[PDB]
Amino acid sequence: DLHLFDNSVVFTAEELSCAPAEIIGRSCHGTSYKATLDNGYMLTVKWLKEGFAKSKKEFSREIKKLGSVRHPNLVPLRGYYWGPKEHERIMISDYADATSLSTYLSEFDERNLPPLSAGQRLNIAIDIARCLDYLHNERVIPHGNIKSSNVLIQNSTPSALVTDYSLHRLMTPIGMAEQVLNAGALGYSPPEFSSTSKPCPSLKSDVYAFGVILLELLTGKIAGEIICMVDLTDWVRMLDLEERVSECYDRHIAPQALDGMLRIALRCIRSASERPEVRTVFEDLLSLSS
Numbered sequence: 001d002l003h004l005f006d007n008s009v010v011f012t013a014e015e016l017s018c019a020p021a022e023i024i025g026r027s028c029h030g031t032s033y034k035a036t037l038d039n040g041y042m043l044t045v046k047w048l049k050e051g052f053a054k055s056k057k058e059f060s061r062e063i064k065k066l067g068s069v070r071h072p073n074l075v076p077l078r079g080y081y082w083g084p085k086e087h088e089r090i091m092i093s094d095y096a097d098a099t100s101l102s103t104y105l106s107e108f109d110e111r112n113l114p115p116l117s118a119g120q121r122l123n124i125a126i127d128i129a130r131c132l133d134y135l136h137n138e139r140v141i142p143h144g145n146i147k148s149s150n151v152l153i154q155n156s157t158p159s160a161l162v163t164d165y166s167l168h169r170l171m172t173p174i175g176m177a178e179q180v181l182n183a184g185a186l187g188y189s190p191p192e193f194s195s196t197s198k199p200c201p202s203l204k205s206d207v208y209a210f211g212v213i214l215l216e217l218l219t220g221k222i223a224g225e226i227i228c229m230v231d232l233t234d235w236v237r238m239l240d241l242e243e244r245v246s247e248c249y250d251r252h253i254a255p256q257a258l259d260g261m262l263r264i265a266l267r268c269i270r271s272a273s274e275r276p277e278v279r280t281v282f283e284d285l286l287s288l289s290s
């Protein structure tokens with residue numbers, strides 16, 4: 001059983017299974033593969049861990065809502081595969097020849113790549129806020145899985161792409177708990193998640209996680225790395241109170257835009273009640289490009 005949302009990208013279930021496939025990576029959700037169709041079309045084949053996918057009726061209903069979600073800065077979801085076995089729960093999207101933000105930030109020196117300039121960092125940030133603006137305001141659906149590994153950097157336009165959106169919409173409580181736990185471990189969970197036994201990703205949690213991304217863009221540090229002081233967000237928050245915010249900036253980059261980005265990032269990581277709406281954040285990041 002293979003379902004395609006549009007007639008734009010068409011293939012068989014037997015064509016997908018007999019396609020040259022290579023592992024992209026593994027996560028809390030499951031594993032990602034790159035599949036190359038006969039005509040050159042490249043797809044992302046994301047297998048959800050067994051027990052993570054909701055029952056067929058709910059999953060189909062929820063994923064069709066996600067299938068209609070389209071934005072230039074969001075990677076298109078083309079379909080899904082539902083097989084006779086319990087492990088055969090696959091989400092199918094476009095494949096982008098890119099490098100993720102976390103891979104760029106951590107392994108840029110090892111690779112040929114030059115560090116991201118101050119302008120590129122502002123640009124990535126605007127492309128992400130643009131996408132969340134649309135999700136939050138027009139579709140009223142949270143991403144809920146924001147992390148630097150879900151931000152893709154490509155040479156072609158648009159420079160930044162957001163992937164793996166709204167997965168909590170398709171999962172059992174088991175699936176959702178594993179996602180929240182992993183986001184907590186990586187540092188993307190807001191302070192209100194501590195007060196709940198079973199917290200759910202939301203429009204509010206997205207703005208928090210977006211704040212952590214802005215901090216990774218500004219410092220050049222991955223969110224889950226411990227710092228001698230300890231938390232990335234705590235580091236910046238502790239440095240700010242001690243009048244030492246400038247010291248957080250990546251040594252590979254100070255343009256006023258970085259300070260603008262910092263004031264926005266700090267607003268994003270405040271309590272739910274003081275946390276700005278995503279349109280305000282998008283507009284404020286956008287004013288920095290002028």
Ligand SMILES: Nc1ncnc2c1ncn2[C@@H]1O[C@H](COP(=O)(O)OP(=O)(O)NP(=O)(O)O)[C@@H](O)[C@H]1O
Pocket residue numbers: 024025026027028029030031032095096097098099100101102103145148149150152164
């Ligand atoms: N198209 C891509 N180009 C480059 N890197 C990618 C691409 N897709 C995924 N990656 C990276 O490969 C790894 C696996 O991606 P993925 O399977 O989406 O897991 P994740 O991003 O770690 N977590 P999640 O998406 O929430 O399940 C991550 O380090 C991604 O940043």
Ligand SMILES: [Mg+2]
Pocket residue numbers: 149150163164
């Ligand atoms: Mg991903």
